[PDB]
Amino acid sequence: SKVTLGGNPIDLAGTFPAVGAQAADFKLVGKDLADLSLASFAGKRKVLNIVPSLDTPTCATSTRKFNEAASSLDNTVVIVVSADLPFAATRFCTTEGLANVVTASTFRTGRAFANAYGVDVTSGPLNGLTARAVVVLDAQDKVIHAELVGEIKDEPNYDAALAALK
Template sequence: MQPFYLQYEDEQIEVTGHFPGLGEPLPSFMLVDDHNNDVSLESFQDRPKALLTLLSLDENEHGGLALLQDTRRRLEKAPAVQLIVVTVDSPSSLRRARREHGLPGVALLSTLRGRDFHKHYGVLLSAYPLAGYTAPALILADVQGRVVFAERLLRSDARFDSAALGAALAALAG
């Protein structure tokens, strides 16, 4: 497997784990929501899913809130898609982010009790200064949980490929 790195300011940080590819099933997970409830991938089984991993909702320009807002705008054309946001933020931080930014219809999940998520989804940042964080990535899956779009960002201040994401969303809708 080819190493993957995230550019964060002046640092190149290795990202480890298996990043799901096109056609692969999403790995099962058990994470914690903003009300301290355990939530599994199977909770979203009847809908297409957009799984967005972020560094933190407390971060704005580097793989955080700005990336979430940009991704939400792009997903507005596909209201059937459930947006699932995963970060290392605590459930109380997720609650505060929901209170401050609204985020209706967005599932906010923490890796607090689901540390295997990082490796199973290929988003584990493995070196200083962000060791243990989740790298910014977006995975779009159909109702059956098969990946139709997958992108990890090369830079923490980048955005996802809008043309490829648009094509994947159109294929889901069609």
């Protein structure tokens, strides 16, 4: 069951997290160039919304609605993870203006986050970006929901991720 892009298999490195696992820590970069780790979000449920890029010419409007809905649930932060630099993150149509939606870039630690989460694309045009996934963590960073989207172009099961927080 390789992930595909336009139906074409791509290679991913690392092992995708299982429900019940302790989430791997990270050092991602916020839109003000500071480092973000799991401790930066202590006490909150976290939605890791992992996307190859949030800087596409056309807005992923459905992702904006999901980001808004999840972040409006009790004690929840949505962490939008991608290789996009913080300079681009300040313009993301899916995050701008939304409280408790926080952009977090992989650029400073390279492939570390993606590899730790089994979303490190290593072939084709997306080589060096994250694959598409949604991983929900509880306050103590136990994985309560995890989806590696089989086709990069497809929408995640946002309903399942939201329901995991209810």
